[PDB]
Every structure is written in structure tokens, then in C-alpha cells.
Amino acid sequence: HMPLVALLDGRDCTVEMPILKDVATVAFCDAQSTQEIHEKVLNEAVGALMYHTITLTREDLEKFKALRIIVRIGSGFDNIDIKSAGDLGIAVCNVPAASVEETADSTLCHILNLYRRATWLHQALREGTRVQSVEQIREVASGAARIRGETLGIIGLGRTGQAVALRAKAFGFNVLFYDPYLSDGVERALGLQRVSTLQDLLFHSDCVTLHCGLNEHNHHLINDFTVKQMRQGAFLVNTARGGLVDEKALAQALKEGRIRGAALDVHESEPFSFSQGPLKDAPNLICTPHAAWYSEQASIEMREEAAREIRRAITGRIPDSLKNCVNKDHLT
Amino acid sequence: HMPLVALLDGRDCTVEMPILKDVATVAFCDAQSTQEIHEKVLNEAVGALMYHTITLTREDLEKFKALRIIVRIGSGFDNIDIKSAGDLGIAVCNVPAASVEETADSTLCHILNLYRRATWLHQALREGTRVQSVEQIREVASGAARIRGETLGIIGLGRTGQAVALRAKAFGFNVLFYDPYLSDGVERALGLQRVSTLQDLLFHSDCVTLHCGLNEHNHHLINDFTVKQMRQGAFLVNTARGGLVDEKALAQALKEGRIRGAALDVHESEPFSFSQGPLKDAPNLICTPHAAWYSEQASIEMREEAAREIRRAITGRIPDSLKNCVNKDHLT
Ligand SMILES: Nc1ncnc2c1ncn2[C@@H]1O[C@H](COP(=O)(O)O)[C@@H](O)[C@H]1O
Ligand SMILES: Nc1ncnc2c1ncn2[C@@H]1O[C@H](COP(=O)(O)O)[C@@H](O)[C@H]1O
Ligand SMILES: [Ca+2]
Ligand SMILES: [Ca+2]
Ligand SMILES: [Cl-]
Ligand SMILES: [Cl-]
Ligand SMILES: [Cl-]
Ligand SMILES: [Cl-]
Ligand SMILES: [Cl-]
Ligand SMILES: [Cl-]
């Protein structure tokens, strides 16, 4: 028979089937954890596809007896211990290009929703507020600010971050970015301003947007300490990873007014709920259910790419034939 | 005594007082119609300031016995019969520059809210929807589309329209515009594509945004007939004037799905209410309470400019000293 490939945290395999039909047997688990995956998959699965709703620890990885390649249908892979996976001889890949501009457009929409209060204005109308006079327009829309001259601070000037910077300049934003891993001069190529420390970024930014990956060194990057370094009444946007922000510190900052508003597509604990979590009673909050990446074309694009990567690993040499393996250094 | 200047449809005069203290007596009416204005104002008012919530017909204008200048605190003046005002010897001015970029940023936010469904996703979370799996993310966010390659059609390429076009290009939009009054070649200067007829604009546009003024020739520009010329599942955005769209025709188009969604900051009858009007049961609708213009700096900027214009008219020669009079042709 063919090698077994399993969709860990999902059920739909329609897009991947035409690409893997003659290369592997495809099954799905629809499991939120390794405890929900049948022994057959853990015993015989040679490849694996997964999104962001299941975590793979070293303990989880050790339970796979034949897994040779994990392909994350998406850009982020913080939910996988790529180091231990490489130790166990498991290559890990991702799909980084499918949702770059989708996430940037969602970020700009979140930024504009804070500066223009469009979402809150709409919600006020749905709740029955009557805005007849100009005085009432100013009151209901109180907080909407002029964008030109404002400083947008970008943390992580990667593919998505660069797309955010290019769009932000079209609105008159003055864009700063902090990225301690980029080579010297990337700010000159894109006509941006760069700072060397996170504190400098937070000190000068009227609006801070996160576009870095979650790694072992930037967990709770926005914490009670760094939150005190942000400008009075600053904006916070996060379409990256919920693990980057201490919602406990963010919640208090919103209540006290030190942060005028926050737009979040990712949270420390998902799915997100307005009735649970540290943000239970936090005001001036816009939240989306981790959908900044999604478009019909982006969804199909990343699923087909991931399928081909699984194919290359089963019919080629690992990791030589892999196109987007993220743990070649750790791979044994 | 000094000449009397009256704030027709408002109450707050704090910003204008320091500019007019030694030039005119300032009073406010806070009236939605001429029927609520005291006889003293109609008899002695030499100047008048007004926003968009009161209409001035020829019948209304004839009731002023000493009015010599009307200054609209804003860009649009469709709520005034400038032709009859000029006939009666009444100069009419506006403030066109204060909210150009504010309105453009609100427009882009409305456009992004349609393509990214950020507002609807937020509202779904506030209503309690649980989005745990990727399949549920696609379902709840169903309709979010990739922006690059889409065609944004602009109706009216004025100051705001041009600002919208410049921003729209940063997202990968291919921008078309229809403006039968612009001189030949304005499309080359700004690197845009131009069409000659409204039908051509609607035929090619995936998203149609209105940025023209309401005049005697474009009332119900979007009607049951022209709505049938728009692409299947097109987007409609209106931060211009509610009188440009036939909400009856728009309502049915949304229900039948011929229009995938509409974002409206202006309506045929304001204040807008989700329980009254032709849009009572229309789906896929985003509405803001005529606040696309508002920012703290823009509000102060236009009020101070309008005050100086009233000053120039009282201490100078009409309409020679006026900076933004819009009816010099009709002025006797
Ligand atoms: N702690 C951090 N602070 C700022 N930027 C970071 C941090 N960690 C990673 N990055 C950057 O974030 C960017 C993300 O890349 P991309 O995968 O293209 O979105 C890269 O340029 C990284 O160097
Ligand atoms: N019916 C119409 N269709 C398209 N454009 C129009 C129409 N009426 C006026 N405009 C244009 O809309 C623009 C508005 O100018 P502005 O005052 O700068 O926003 C001007 O360029 C007008 O020529
Ligand atoms: Ca501020
Ligand atoms: Ca379409
Ligand atoms: Cl995902
Ligand atoms: Cl402001
Ligand atoms: Cl899909
Ligand atoms: Cl106004
Ligand atoms: Cl799409
Ligand atoms: Cl004001």
C-alpha cells in the first residue's frame, strides 16, 4: 500500500486529494490534541498536515512511530517543537507566501478601524444610538484621529511587515520598525526609519503593530514592563500570535486608558470569547477570530502547496527536495 | 451694535468665538429647520453658519431679511439652494479641505471592512459565535476575498477621490474612475485608468465607491437601472451623499445577492436607523452615522476656517474677499 498521510487538526481534504491520490493514503483526525488521534495514525503515518489548533510537543512527537515530515498548512509553526522534531528525524515545513497580503490588508483594516472607529460606530448604530446633530456625531465618534503625521511602529519587518509598511505610507503614516535580525540597510532599500531596541519603537509609536513570529525569545514581548514604555493612549494591533502579548497587562492598560484601543486577531487562548480570558472586561477592544489570513484564493493556494510539499517528501529526498523546510539545522 | 451671525443647526460656538468676538454677535439656533429659528435671527442675521442637518430652500432663504453670507462648515453644500441664494444676493461658501484625507481613510476602512469582513467578524464574536477549527474560520469568514487584482471603480475623482485612488493602489487595486467633468489627461498625471460612461465604470468594477457631490444631475445615480449594470456580487461604498443611491434598489440587490455588500456613511434620510428605511431588512450592510469626515483636528480646522470666512465677508467685500464661495456665478 501507499504511505499514510494524516490531516491532524482538520476534516476537509478535498483540495489535497487530487495532488496526493497516487502518492499516499489520506486520512483526517479532526483532533485538538494527540489524545484524539487513533493509534493507526500514530503508528503508520509517514506524513502529516496540520493547521494552528493542535500543538505538537516533544511528548506528542515521540508518539509517532513512522512520521517523517510535518507540513504546516500556514506560515506560523510556533505550535510545533521543530527542534525536537528534527532530533527525532522529522522535517517540518510551512507555507509562508499564501497569506502575506491578506494578513497585511487585515492589519490595515484593523488599524483604520482604530483610527476611524468604523467598527465601533457601526456597532453603536446596531445598538440603537441616534446620531442626529453634529455635536452627537463628535460625541459618538469621539476618539477618531487624523492619521497623517502619526507614527506607526512595526515589530518584525518580514514579508507581511513590509507589506504593512508599504500600505501604511500611503495614508501618511511615518513608519518605524524594530527587527533585530534584519541585515544592515534594509531600512534604506524601503525608505523607512529603523530603531535598534523595542523600547525605542514603543517610545515613538502612536500605533504599534506586531508582525513577528512567536519564538523562544519574544513570548510576552508586550508585557506589564514594555506596556509602560508605549506612548500615552497608543494603539495596539496583533495579527501575528497571541503569545506575544500579556493580555493581563493589556487588559489593565485598556481599563486605565494607557492604551486607547487594541485590535486583535490572535489571542493567548483560542478560540477567543468576549466572556472569558483576561480581556473579559477590557474596553475599546476589537477582535476577529484568527481570520486575518483567510481568503478563498489564499486558502486554496496554501492547501495545494502543502500537498505538493508532502508529495515531494514522499517521492523525493528529505530534506533536499523540500521547498519550505524550517528545521534543516535540527534535522538528523 | 455688531452684525449678527447665527449658528443655524448647532449649539457649540466655542471654537468660532475667539475669531468673531470683535466682528459680530454670535448666537446659535440648534434648529433642524427654519421653523425652529427665532424671528430675531431671520430678521437681523447678516451671516450664518450651518452643517448638513438643516436644509435651506428658496422658501427658507426668502425668510431671511438681512442675510448676506452663508458659510457651510463642511465640504458639501447640497442642502442649500445656492442658485436662489445667489438670486437673493446671498453668497454661499464651504470648507473643502479640512476632511479630505479623513474621508479617504474612512472610505478605505469601509472597503477593507467589506473585503476582510473585520467588522462582521467582530460582531459575530460579540454575538457569541465559537470559531475553533479552521473549517469554522472559513465558514464564519466566508466571503473574504483577495484584494490584489480586484478593480476599484471611483465615481468622482476630486480631492477625496484622488486620495482614495492613491491609497487603493497600495493594496494592489486596479483603479478605474468616471468623472465627466475633469479635463482630458488627469488619468495620465495620476497613473490611473479612466472610463467615459457610468455604465463602463459599473461594468468593470468589483468595488464601486462614490466620491462625487450631490448636484441636480446625479440624484439616484445608483438606481434600479444602473444597479443592474454592476458586476455580480459587487461591493458598494458611499461616504459622499445618501441622495446618490436609491436605497430601495440597493436593498433588493443586497437581498437577492446581486450586491455582495454595502458600506454606507450617508443615507437618503438621516439620522440612519437599522429599524427604519428601505434598508430595514437588507443583509450584508455596514453603516456609520455620517462620521467619515470627523477628526478632532479636522473638526477644529473647518470651524476656524469657516469663522475666518464669515469675518472676511463682514469686514471685506463680497464676494471678492471670500476664499471659498461656491455661487459667484449666481450671486447678484
Ligand atoms: N522578537 C522580535 N522582534 C522583532 N522582530 C522579530 C522578532 N522575532 C522575529 N522577528 C522578525 O519578524 C520577521 C518575520 O518574518 P516573516 O516570516 O517574513 O513574517 C522576521 O524579519 C524576523 O527577523
Ligand atoms: N455625476 C457625477 N459623476 C461622476 N463624477 C462627478 C459627478 N458629479 C461631480 N463629479 C465629480 O466629483 C468630484 C468632486 O470634487 P471634490 O469636491 O474635490 O470632491 C469632481 O471632480 C466632480 O467633477
Ligand atoms: Ca494620540
Ligand atoms: Ca467578486
Ligand atoms: Cl491556519
Ligand atoms: Cl485628530
Ligand atoms: Cl479552501
Ligand atoms: Cl458636517
Ligand atoms: Cl479570494
Ligand atoms: Cl470641534
Offer a few descriptive terms.
homodimer; 332 residues; alpha/beta; 2 domains; 7-stranded parallel sheet; 5-stranded parallel sheet; 13 helices; binds adenosine monophosphate; binds calcium ion; binds chloride ion
Give an overview of the whole structure.
Chains A, B: Residues 3-45 are annotated as: Interaction with GLIS2 1. The structure is a homodimer of 332-residue chains. Chain A is of the alpha/beta class and 332 residues long. Chain A has 13 helices and 12 strands. Chain A has a 7-stranded parallel beta sheet with strand order 8-7-6-9-10-11-12. The first copy, chain A, is globular, with a radius of gyration of 22 Å. Chain A starts with a strand and ends in a 17-residue tail after the last helix. The relative contact order of chain A is 0.15. Chains A and B meet through helix 5, helix 6, helix 7, helix 8 and helix 13 of A and helix 5, helix 6, helix 7, helix 8 and helix 13 of B. Bound molecules: adenosine monophosphate (2 copies), calcium ion (2 copies) and chloride ion (CL) (6 copies). One adenosine monophosphate is lined by residues 96, 155-161, 178-179, 181-182, 211-213, 215, 218, 221 of chain B. Residues 96, 155-161, 178-179, 181-182, 211-213, 215, 218, 221 of chain A line the site of one adenosine monophosphate.
